[PDB]
């Protein structure tokens, strides 16, 4: 979920 949570955070 981490890499997806980051993307969602930045984007």
């Amino acid at each position, epitope marked *: *979920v981490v890499q997806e949570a980051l993307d969602k955070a930045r984007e």
Partner: single-chain antibody
Amino acid sequence: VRDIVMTQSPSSLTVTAGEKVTMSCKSSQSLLNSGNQKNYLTWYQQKPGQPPKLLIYWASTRESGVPDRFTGSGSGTDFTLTISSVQAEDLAVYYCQNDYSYPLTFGAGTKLEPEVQLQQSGAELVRPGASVKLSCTASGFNIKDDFMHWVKQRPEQGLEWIGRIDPANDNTKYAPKFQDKATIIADTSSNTAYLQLSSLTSEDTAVYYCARREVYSYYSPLDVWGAGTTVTVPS
């Protein structure tokens, strides 16, 4: 849904200078992201009295400054850290961390036997049943640009992820076992992150560290760790 267990071995290992050491880190579940083919495994080196130092992330990429004699390898569920020729200043304990999916979990580690920073509040002495607030102030960057994490570590040595918050949207994520005992708050105004523990027991006696994770890069592990605040709950 489980948690993903990190099993490190050997736990202890008397070593003699020059020797070759090989530490193993296995995960209960895949740590591989088939999307970008990266293994979300990070290695930390920790000398006594200090907070974990970032060694390697994504399984094999060495952080800037770590000697070539250190090598991270493995894929999916089997990872290993190797020191081609152990040096003196190489001792300490080593932890591998699951950075693939929440909650982030650390292994028990392998103990080898022979300006950007985070300001943390003073040591605490508290009675069982009480609550205490710990503080973490970034001194070199804006916390609105990072995820502020809280890590626990009792005298044992095992690192325990408590949770993390997104100062920008106040979005927080908590490890299952700390979902009640902990509450993470952020105040971008003062650029400080707080952690509150309630209903303290002797099980809470430990060293609490805060850490940051940049969210502007595509990806980044937990690099900057505060010195930590010792919380003592005498039974």
